[PDB]
């Protein structure tokens, strides 16, 4: 059975509809795949010795 | 632009009038 009253309420503008190469299509994906951001390693360059900690081979 | 004044135009010498 098809009811028209439901789809009248479900009216979406055509310009608001997502195209093929629109990044809003993969916005729903990017929510499911939740990327883990790195905790910042607090580095102080003042403490770093240039001559020593540079690799030597 | 780039077009000079003496390409395809008559050039009149702009001189100050004799009463001035």
């Amino acid at each position: 059975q098809i009811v028209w009253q439901n789809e009248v309420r479900r009216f979406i503008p055509q310009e608001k509809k997502l195209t093929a190469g629109n990044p809003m299509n993969f916005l729903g994906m990017a929510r499911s795949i939740n990327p883990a951001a790195n905790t910042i390693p607090k580095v102080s360059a003042q403490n770093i010795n240039i001559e020593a900690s540079v690799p030597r081979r | 632009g780039s077009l000079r004044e003496d390409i395809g135009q008559r050039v009149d010498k702009e001189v100050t009038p004799r009463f001035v």
């Binding site: 055509q14 310009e15 | 077009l3 390409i7 395809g8 135009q9 008559r10």
Partner: protein, 161 residues
């Protein structure tokens, strides 16, 4: 042809979206300049033959073109040159009133360079003649509307080249 109103409608129509505030500001700018455009058109219409008169005298007269051997020697050629500058001035006012250079790229320039090449009409000279119109029109009407007229007269010069 397209005027400034139709141009912003067509730009919204091609995208298939309603006229937003940014597109509405384009209209409001035209409705602000509309009084300046109508008044300018009335001045040029009155001195239509008069603007050409000064422009030919400033640029074209007492030159190579009018002298025997030139492209304005015969009376038929001279009258056609007046007719051509009468064309250029009339269509520049149309584009000014419209607020878009759509009529110029439709009825003035689209197949003019080919005719001017074939007839042997010097484009370098006629551009200077339109530049002579531009100086007369700006002096008669004003600096505000003469700049507006200037753009569309420059548009013809660009299309001819």
């Amino acid at each position: 042809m397209q005027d400034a109103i139709t141009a912003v409608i067509n730009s919204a129509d091609v995208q298939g979206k309603y006229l937003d505030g940014a597109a509405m500001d384009k209209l409001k700018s035209y409705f602000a300049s509309g009084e300046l455009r109508v008044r300018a058109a009335s001045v040029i219409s009155a001195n239509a033959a008069t603007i050409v008169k000064e422009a030919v005298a400033k640029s074209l007269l007492y030159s190579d073109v009018t002298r025997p051997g030139g492209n304005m020697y015969t009376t038929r050629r001279y009258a056609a040159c007046i007719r051509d500058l009468d064309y250029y001035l009339r269509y520049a006012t149309y584009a000014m009133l419209a607020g878009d250079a759509s009529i110029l790229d439709e009825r003035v320039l689209n197949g003019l360079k080919e005719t001017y090449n074939s007839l042997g009409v010097p484009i370098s000279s006629t551009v200077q003649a339109i530049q002579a119109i531009k100086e007369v029109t700006a002096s008669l009407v004003g600096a505000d509307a003469g700049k507006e007229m200037g753009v569309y007269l420059d548009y013809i010069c660009s299309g001819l080249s």
